[PDB]
Design a protein around this nucleic acid. Structure first.
Ligand SMILES: [Zn+2]
Length: 273
DNA sequence: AGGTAGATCCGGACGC
DNA sequence: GCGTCCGGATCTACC
């Protein structure tokens, strides 16, 4: 899940949990719990708190409780559902928050990559994993100037730059490839090689792409669904991601796939320069 | 130096 | 049955 997927989950999850009071927290894979590292302390401190809100920072969900914030990263396969305490759990359910009304918030994660950190609300923003995060891309804090300031300093691939959460929050393998295609920039270009005009174009397309994907409920390419189990529709608007060997929608040249910045990387060798 | 590729955490889908 | 793939992202060897 990237920004648009996490945003859609946030929007669809909040009304199912707001105002509910935690009665128990059960943990079946303790490695998910990162702070407090002792999963018994993590569970104990959340009991008796009520869900007051649900925010997103980058790819993180921030559950606002009474005194605490719970910071959750779904990573590759993490997802939340709300269901009755009377039903058997689905496979790969690793954390369960039981509410006083007999419902439960269930965290499922086949690959177990997800993370959870709990801190007092006033501390969460100055501690990991939120502390290092770059600006929200749909905010004034992300501008071409902010992008150029990081780009000019490094010969790393522009893909590696955009995947770096300290540069800008929220972009992952899909939206990086898509933004670069739309901006006409090859993903292996050294960041410092981008012209002033290329940086402006890239910022514009990043903002447009993420915005569009939010409006479409995210991209369902393998396993992503919203909290109601509904697929997104942005996958029908992809120019390059997952389209290797198919014609470019713009020029008909076959889309190519390589590895860049350690990730599968999709591009049109004609439209991107 | 600082960028890149491999290893790691993890396990299911998929094609051959 | 067996590599390889995967909306994340660290660390660790290499130059
Ligand atoms: Zn093209």
């Amino acid at each position: 899940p990237q920004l648009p997927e996490v945003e859609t989950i946030r929007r669809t999850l909040l009304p199912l949990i707001v105002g509910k009071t935690i009665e128990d927290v059960r943990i079946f894979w303790p490695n998910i719990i990162r702070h407090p590292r002792d999963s018994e302390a993590f569970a104990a401190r959340m009991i008796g708190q009520t869900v007051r809100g649900l925010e997103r920072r980058g790819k993180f969900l921030k559950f606002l409780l009474d005194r605490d914030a719970l910071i959750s990263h779904l990573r590759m396969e993490g997802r939340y559902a709300v269901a009755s305490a009377l039903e058997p759990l689905e496979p790969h359910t690793h954390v369960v928050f039981c509410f006083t009304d007999g419902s439960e918030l269930r965290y499922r994660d086949v690959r177990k990559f997800g993370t959870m950190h709990v801190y007092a609300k006033e501390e969460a923003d100055r501690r990991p994993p939120l502390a290092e995060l770059g600006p929200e891309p749909l905010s004034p804090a992300f501008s071409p100037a902010v992008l150029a300031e990081r780009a000019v300093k490094t010969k790393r691939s522009v893909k590696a730059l955009l995947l770096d959460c300290t540069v800008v929050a929220g972009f992952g393998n899909i939206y990086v490839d898509e933004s670069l295609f739309r901006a006409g920039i090859l993903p292996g270009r050294p960041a410092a090689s981008l012209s002033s005009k290329e940086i402006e174009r890239l910022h514009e397309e990043m903002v447009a792409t993420i915005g569009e994907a939010v409006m479409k409920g995210g991209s369902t390419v393998r396993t992503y669904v919203n909290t109601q189990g509904e697929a997104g529709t942005f996958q029908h608007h992809l120019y390059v991601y997952g389209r290797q060997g198919n014609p470019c929608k713009r020029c008909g040249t076959p889309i190519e796939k390589t590895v860049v910045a350690g990730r599968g990387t999709h591009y049109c060798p004609r439209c991107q320069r």
